[PDB]
Design an enzyme around this catalytic site. Sequence first.
Site, short mmCIF file in Angstrom:
data_model
loop_
_atom_site.label_atom_id
_atom_site.label_comp_id
_atom_site.label_asym_id
_atom_site.label_seq_id
_atom_site.Cartn_x
_atom_site.Cartn_y
_atom_site.Cartn_z
N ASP A 22 -6.01 4.48 29.04
CA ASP A 22 -6.07 4.71 27.57
C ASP A 22 -6.70 6.10 27.30
O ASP A 22 -6.23 6.76 26.35
CB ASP A 22 -6.90 3.63 26.84
CG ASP A 22 -6.16 2.35 26.43
OD1 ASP A 22 -4.98 2.21 26.78
OD2 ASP A 22 -6.77 1.50 25.70
N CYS A 39 6.85 8.94 25.65
CA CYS A 39 5.49 8.34 25.60
C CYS A 39 5.24 7.97 24.14
O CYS A 39 6.21 7.53 23.49
CB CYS A 39 4.51 9.26 26.30
SG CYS A 39 4.57 11.01 25.74
N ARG A 88 2.26 13.01 28.33
CA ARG A 88 2.73 12.34 29.58
C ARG A 88 4.20 12.70 29.88
O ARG A 88 4.56 12.94 31.07
CB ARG A 88 2.58 10.82 29.49
CG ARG A 88 1.13 10.40 29.26
CD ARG A 88 0.95 8.91 28.99
NE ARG A 88 -0.31 8.62 28.33
CZ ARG A 88 -0.68 7.40 27.93
NH1 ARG A 88 0.15 6.37 28.07
NH2 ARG A 88 -1.86 7.24 27.34
N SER A 89 5.05 12.68 28.87
CA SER A 89 6.49 13.04 29.02
C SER A 89 6.62 14.45 29.64
O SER A 89 7.53 14.67 30.50
CB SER A 89 7.19 12.95 27.69
OG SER A 89 7.35 11.61 27.25
N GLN A 113 -0.53 18.34 26.57
CA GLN A 113 -1.37 18.24 25.33
C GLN A 113 -2.84 18.62 25.58
O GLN A 113 -3.55 18.86 24.56
CB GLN A 113 -1.38 16.81 24.76
CG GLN A 113 -0.11 16.42 24.04
CD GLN A 113 -0.11 14.96 23.58
OE1 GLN A 113 -0.09 13.99 24.37
NE2 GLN A 113 -0.19 14.77 22.29
#
Length: 284
Positions: free
Chosen positions: A181, A215, A221-222, A262
Amino acid sequence: MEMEKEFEQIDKSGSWAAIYQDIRHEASDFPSRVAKLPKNKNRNRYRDVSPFDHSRIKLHQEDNDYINASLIKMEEAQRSYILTQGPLPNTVGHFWEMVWEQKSRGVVMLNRVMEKGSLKCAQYWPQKEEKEMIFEDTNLKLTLISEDIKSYYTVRQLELENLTTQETREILHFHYTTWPDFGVPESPASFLNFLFKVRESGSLSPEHGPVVVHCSAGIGRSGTFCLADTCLLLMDKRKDPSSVDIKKVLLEMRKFRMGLIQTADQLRFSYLAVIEGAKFIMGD
Ligand SMILES: NC(=O)[C@@H]1CN2CCN(CC3CC3)C[C@@H]2[C@H]1c1ccccc1
């Protein structure tokens, strides 16, 4: 410069934030005027994450062709990817329309439906064989065929049917279920194992439409998934694998979708995955 050395030199100097901000400053800025039309506000999960007009995927219809999705085309590596947001309640039908229209074999999911106590994407696939889903707005049917649950990921076989044509297609759903998370994984070993399972399926190969990768926003994440895959393919094609510059590959990919990677921690994790993934082929 051999990236494993570049790696220890950034760690020892603790300059990950400085490298990451340099990337943010040099990244492309292209218009996204279609994404910002008022008729499209309920098609965007986040106000600050939009596909560029020049690279956006167009839905095959006259009513409204908009979806929050971009075509990433990597010329030297000969790989293409579609990066998209997690589907919303009113875009699940759009999502499946796209998968069908683009002739994709594989969908790659890097998030859970619920994370941090909030919904990160719609439940957009069926959980039981005998309870299929019909997408009223797009005239498609989706059936669960089988499910293989492992410790770090799940692979599902789905059947997608064009109702009007009665054409059917097998779609493979690759679900990475253990990204934490908060932050990034401690080791890239299970993420690299997962990437190698998607490759082995044929989903990334030129005989199919591009893989659909998501994602929650479809950039973090992508971004890590496509950047690691392209860097490892370039290392196997070039005479000198130490010539592959991960910062230059990421800026090329940022021509096609804004904001890929990110955080500075996602940037470090991407270097780690490529360094370790090379060893497993260029060594093991
Ligand atoms: N969303 C769309 O308009 C596209 C275009 N096509 C014609 C209009 N039909 C809406 C009528 C109820 C049949 C919906 C579908 C749909 C689609 C077709 C085939 C595969 C995937 C998606």
